[PDB]
Design an enzyme around this catalytic site. Sequence first.
Site, short mmCIF file in Angstrom:
data_model
loop_
_atom_site.label_atom_id
_atom_site.label_comp_id
_atom_site.label_asym_id
_atom_site.label_seq_id
_atom_site.Cartn_x
_atom_site.Cartn_y
_atom_site.Cartn_z
N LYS A 1 10.39 27.97 -5.17
CA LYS A 1 10.94 29.18 -5.72
C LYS A 1 10.79 30.33 -4.70
CE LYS A 1 9.72 27.64 -10.36
NZ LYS A 1 8.91 26.43 -10.07
N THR B 1 4.33 25.99 -7.50
CA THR B 1 5.39 25.28 -6.83
C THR B 1 5.64 25.93 -5.48
OG1 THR B 1 7.11 26.67 -7.87
CG2 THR B 1 6.45 24.64 -8.99
N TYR C 1 3.44 4.71 3.45
CA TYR C 1 2.55 4.67 2.26
C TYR C 1 1.12 5.14 2.62
CZ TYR C 1 4.11 3.13 -2.39
OH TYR C 1 4.64 3.11 -3.65
N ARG D 1 10.81 21.35 -2.57
CA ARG D 1 10.41 21.07 -3.94
C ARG D 1 9.08 20.30 -3.90
NH1 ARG D 1 15.02 22.75 -6.59
NH2 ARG D 1 13.97 22.36 -8.58
N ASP E 1 -0.90 29.96 -13.34
CA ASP E 1 0.29 29.27 -12.78
C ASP E 1 1.13 30.36 -12.17
OD1 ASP E 1 2.85 28.02 -12.23
OD2 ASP E 1 2.75 26.89 -14.10
N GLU F 1 -1.67 6.22 0.13
CA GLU F 1 -2.45 6.46 -1.08
C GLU F 1 -3.89 6.82 -0.81
OE1 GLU F 1 -0.97 2.55 -2.61
OE2 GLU F 1 -1.43 3.54 -4.50
C1 GCF Z 1 -3.70 1.26 -3.41
C2 GCF Z 1 -3.02 0.47 -4.50
N1 GCF Z 1 -2.12 0.96 -5.37
N2 GCF Z 1 -1.65 0.02 -6.33
C3 GCF Z 1 -2.29 -1.10 -6.01
C4 GCF Z 1 -3.19 -0.97 -4.86
C5 GCF Z 1 -4.03 -2.10 -4.35
C6 GCF Z 1 -5.51 -1.70 -4.30
C7 GCF Z 1 -6.03 -0.65 -5.08
C8 GCF Z 1 -7.38 -0.31 -5.02
C9 GCF Z 1 -7.90 0.83 -5.81
C10 GCF Z 1 -7.23 2.04 -5.79
C11 GCF Z 1 -7.71 3.12 -6.53
C12 GCF Z 1 -8.86 2.99 -7.27
C13 GCF Z 1 -9.54 1.77 -7.28
C14 GCF Z 1 -10.80 1.61 -8.09
C15 GCF Z 1 -11.99 1.17 -7.21
C16 GCF Z 1 -12.88 2.31 -6.73
O1 GCF Z 1 -12.95 3.37 -7.39
O2 GCF Z 1 -13.54 2.11 -5.68
C17 GCF Z 1 -9.05 0.70 -6.55
C18 GCF Z 1 -8.25 -1.03 -4.24
C19 GCF Z 1 -7.79 -2.09 -3.46
C20 GCF Z 1 -8.76 -2.88 -2.59
F1 GCF Z 1 -9.70 -3.36 -3.39
F2 GCF Z 1 -8.22 -3.89 -1.92
F3 GCF Z 1 -9.35 -2.06 -1.73
C21 GCF Z 1 -6.43 -2.43 -3.49
C22 GCF Z 1 -3.43 -2.56 -3.00
C23 GCF Z 1 -1.93 -2.90 -3.04
C24 GCF Z 1 -3.67 -1.59 -1.82
C25 GCF Z 1 -3.94 -3.31 -5.30
C26 GCF Z 1 -4.73 -4.28 -5.06
N3 GCF Z 1 -5.45 -5.17 -4.84
C27 GCF Z 1 -3.05 -3.39 -6.32
N4 GCF Z 1 -2.93 -4.43 -7.13
O3 GCF Z 1 -2.14 -2.31 -6.62
C1 PLG Z 2 5.54 28.81 -14.20
C2 PLG Z 2 6.20 27.49 -13.90
N1 PLG Z 2 5.43 26.41 -13.69
C3 PLG Z 2 5.91 25.19 -13.43
C4 PLG Z 2 7.27 24.92 -13.32
C5 PLG Z 2 7.67 23.49 -13.05
O1 PLG Z 2 8.21 23.22 -11.77
P1 PLG Z 2 9.05 21.86 -11.54
O2 PLG Z 2 10.40 22.28 -12.04
O3 PLG Z 2 8.96 21.77 -10.04
O4 PLG Z 2 8.45 20.78 -12.38
C6 PLG Z 2 8.26 26.01 -13.54
C7 PLG Z 2 9.77 25.79 -13.44
N2 PLG Z 2 10.59 26.68 -14.24
C8 PLG Z 2 12.04 26.61 -14.24
C9 PLG Z 2 12.65 27.97 -13.91
O5 PLG Z 2 11.95 29.00 -13.89
O6 PLG Z 2 13.84 28.01 -13.61
C10 PLG Z 2 7.68 27.35 -13.83
O7 PLG Z 2 8.49 28.42 -14.03
C1 PLG Z 3 4.68 -2.58 -9.14
C2 PLG Z 3 4.52 -1.15 -8.68
N1 PLG Z 3 4.87 -0.14 -9.49
C3 PLG Z 3 4.76 1.15 -9.18
C4 PLG Z 3 4.29 1.58 -7.94
C5 PLG Z 3 4.18 3.07 -7.74
O1 PLG Z 3 5.08 3.64 -6.81
P1 PLG Z 3 4.81 5.14 -6.28
O2 PLG Z 3 3.84 4.94 -5.16
O3 PLG Z 3 6.18 5.48 -5.78
O4 PLG Z 3 4.19 5.91 -7.41
C6 PLG Z 3 3.85 0.57 -6.93
C7 PLG Z 3 3.30 0.92 -5.54
N2 PLG Z 3 2.29 0.04 -5.01
C8 PLG Z 3 1.74 0.27 -3.68
C9 PLG Z 3 1.95 -0.90 -2.72
O5 PLG Z 3 2.31 -2.02 -3.12
O6 PLG Z 3 1.77 -0.70 -1.52
C10 PLG Z 3 3.99 -0.84 -7.33
O7 PLG Z 3 3.62 -1.82 -6.50
#
Ligand code: GCF
Ligand code: PLG
Ligand code: PLG
Lengths: 442, 442
Positions: A237, A234, A54, A243, A208, A56
């Site tokens: 292609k 992308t 992970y 992908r 694009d 992010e």
């Molecule tokens: C990175 C991430 N993704 N989803 C999350 C987090 C998470 C998180 C997101 C953030 C987060 C991520 C993106 C943007 C922001 C807004 C704050 C800013 O712009 O500085 C906060 C910050 C924290 C921290 F405060 F602890 F640093 C933590 C944890 C799991 C890493 C979080 C919490 N607490 C929750 N609830 O969920």
């Molecule tokens: C110009 C253009 N932009 C974006 C995408 C989107 O890509 P994803 O499928 O990875 O979301 C396509 C896919 N076009 C399908 C095809 O030409 O067969 C495309 O032709």
């Molecule tokens: C409840 C929940 N839903 C959706 C996502 C999104 O998953 P993708 O990263 O695959 O977009 C997270 C990831 N949360 C980050 C963590 O707990 O470390 C999550 O905790």
Amino acid sequence: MFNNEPLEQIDKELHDILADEEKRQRETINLIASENLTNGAVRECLGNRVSNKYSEGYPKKRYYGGNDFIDKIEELCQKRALEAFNVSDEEWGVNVQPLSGSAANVQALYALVGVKGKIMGMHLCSGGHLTHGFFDEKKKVSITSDMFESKLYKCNSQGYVDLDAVREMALSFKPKVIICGYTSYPRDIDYQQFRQICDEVNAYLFADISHISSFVACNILNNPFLHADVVTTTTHKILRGPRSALIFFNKKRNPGIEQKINSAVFPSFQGGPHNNKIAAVACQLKEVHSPAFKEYTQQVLLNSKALAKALISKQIDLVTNGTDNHLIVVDLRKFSITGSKLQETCNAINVSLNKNTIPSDVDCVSPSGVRIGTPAMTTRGAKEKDMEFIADVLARAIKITVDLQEQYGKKLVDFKKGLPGNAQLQQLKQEVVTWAGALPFP
Amino acid sequence: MFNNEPLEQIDKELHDILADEEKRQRETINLIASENLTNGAVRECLGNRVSNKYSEGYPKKRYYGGNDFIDKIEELCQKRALEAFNVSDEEWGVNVQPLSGSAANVQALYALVGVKGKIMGMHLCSGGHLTHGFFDEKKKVSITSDMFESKLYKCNSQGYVDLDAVREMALSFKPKVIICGYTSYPRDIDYQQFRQICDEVNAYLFADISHISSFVACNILNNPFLHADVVTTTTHKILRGPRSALIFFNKKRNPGIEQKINSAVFPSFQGGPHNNKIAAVACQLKEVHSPAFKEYTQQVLLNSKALAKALISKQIDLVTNGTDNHLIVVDLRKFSITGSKLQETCNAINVSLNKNTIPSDVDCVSPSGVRIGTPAMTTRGAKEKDMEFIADVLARAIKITVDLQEQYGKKLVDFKKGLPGNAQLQQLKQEVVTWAGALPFP
Ligand SMILES: Cc1[nH]nc2c1[C@](c1cc(-c3cccc(CCC(=O)O)c3)cc(C(F)(F)F)c1)(C(C)C)C(C#N)=C(N)O2
Ligand SMILES: Cc1ncc(COP(=O)(O)O)c(CNCC(=O)O)c1O
Ligand SMILES: Cc1ncc(COP(=O)(O)O)c(CNCC(=O)O)c1O
Ligand SMILES: Cc1[nH]nc2c1[C@](c1cc(-c3cccc(CCC(=O)O)c3)cc(C(F)(F)F)c1)(C(C)C)C(C#N)=C(N)O2
Ligand SMILES: [Cl-]
């Protein structure tokens, strides 16, 4: 406490379907303009343990630590992307996190315009993508017509981008962004004229280049990086990567664009990046920047010219009567068969292609064409000499499709019953299988 | 016309960084609550040639043909997903195409409410995800706060979901959807009470069970399927699959939801599915539905109880004073060190964990805790008795962090100069590396 038995042992049911999929790929004439075939090294990356992590955020600004090796990979991918597309990292940035083409487009658009923002793109039926604002009377089919206000511009009756219409629409509509670069458009693009129209109304230029990426990188076609604010592409292609997708942004023309794009991708839309993807994109982007890959891209255009020429020698009509790139659209009106019929006929002979609108088709309900392209078969080693066979095979399929329609009727359900157990299709299929199976397969 | 040399030959630069990443994973006490380790079979799927195929649409209704084997894989995946979560395919449907958790959530939310629609979710700082409507005064940080109108509910001063507050907010705000299931919430969820509140206002019930999926599937924790309209989950955390996601929809409680969700995923947001992902998800779901995997999940909860208990025995405070699941949030107020300081200290000793807000922190600017979890280490083979060593290591990290803050000061840039070359950290790292390196590694 895990099961490390190999795939064949752990799940025999899935392993058979996968071994079957592989056989069909090996024994198919793949003319899907958007498909290619990845090498073993790109596929080693995709299955690497780096997808366990992970990470992010962005390099040196992650939310978690332990991302030192991931940060090198992500920085290596960005560097290699900029070198491949002939851009200075002082003038251009690139986000490598978008999971696919469509996500990249919606993220980039949102960055530029926000919700309720105004955008212009080519209509789906005229070769535009879904993510270029596509809608219909019945529904706003793409989120890019719903989260944004979109207006759609058509190609002329000969299939060319009608610039006077783009201008006409932009001056009334006054969008924030005008999208160019298309999904099934057989000619090169006048980016300069697009740049001239954008300035006139103060809109951003979005290029694009997903279908033509390799041509831009290798300098065979026009370079939208000379005129464009944003370039998306992308990597699966013609570029021949995994992908994934790339968003390029022009810092020099737009100070502050770097943060909006980066924040649009994360945390506005995505969460954790897929590091296996980013690794794989790094691996392919090194190959993109060799002269060997330029040889490959050149061969794609050589094959495509040969193929269009051979199809015209058999009196088959092509939209715009030719091609400047990897793809051709075949106009099927003179035979009175539909694109979906020929797609069924071609699936029946292991030829992969897709149904595709043409300028005469008001609707998307019955496309009068098929689209084909050379990247896949060029990857498999086919030269200009081989294109006469593919045009031969496609001509025979059109004729059989006309025979079958005569016998069983023009309705699609009635048409299909004719297909299985057709003597000529089995014969053509065996012909297709015997040549395709021989070809180099990555 | 392709380069089939192995990854090591074709690109030595990338290959070394990947061999380095692998080594760091092998030698790290990984306590990231959201991470796991995929087995070799899941990684054979992710690198399969099935990712070559474009297959836009759904099975038996693809845009292209040549999708016979892809359709079996995608049908096999949905079937295996419904069997894993103890749901009848007559009453429940599942979309298997979303590329990741955040995409699944935005798509599913769009299906239910549309643009400008009203949603309620747990605040980020109180343990909710970004995709549950997260904004700040300053910015609409998630698209889920921008493309939707979101309102955010907090946990009480002891870290529990405050239902009386959720109900009070719902009656004033009247959303179409209320999201439950979180990113850093250490207790089980009262879905029934959520389902009672949704009916009273006529909003949909959304359960994001990404962090607790294996607990729902294996019937160890409460089952939101009894009460929820929509259930989303990632497949890469405790479930131990590839990086992907699943949207479940309850057909019986909502006729016509199947189409709305399917169209939201494609063509509204996504284009081509990632078939290597779907294969990989299929493969892991076979493992999920086994008594062997339930033994693993049970071991995750046993390790987590033990870890919480050992940390409390060393006078370390936990939010909600314990856990019902895989994760613990340590409150670091009694030591006067921040979560990010301990994250740096822990990275310095190869201990992977993340900084995390606690109830007392009004602002997200300085999180006063760290979040930890057992799925990764449980996968590597740690048992209850091993948790005392991890608690020992974490206690030592907190102490060293206090020592370093004493010497160099509480400002963050100053704090870090103390880290490299610290004799105890090198010594503690060496301890960590020696134990972790020995453990089974998929
Ligand atoms: C990175 C991430 N993704 N989803 C999350 C987090 C998470 C998180 C997101 C953030 C987060 C991520 C993106 C943007 C922001 C807004 C704050 C800013 O712009 O500085 C906060 C910050 C924290 C921290 F405060 F602890 F640093 C933590 C944890 C799991 C890493 C979080 C919490 N607490 C929750 N609830 O969920
Ligand atoms: C110009 C253009 N932009 C974006 C995408 C989107 O890509 P994803 O499928 O990875 O979301 C396509 C896919 N076009 C399908 C095809 O030409 O067969 C495309 O032709
Ligand atoms: C409840 C929940 N839903 C959706 C996502 C999104 O998953 P993708 O990263 O695959 O977009 C997270 C990831 N949360 C980050 C963590 O707990 O470390 C999550 O905790
Ligand atoms: C599947 C897809 N994705 N992006 C595309 C297409 C594509 C396309 C999309 C569609 C398409 C896909 C999704 C939704 C819709 C809306 C109409 C409907 O609901 O049936 C059309 C249809 C066609 C067809 F008309 F030929 F059948 C073709 C091609 C490349 C397959 C297209 C065209 N023509 C263009 N320009 O771009
Ligand atoms: Cl992937």
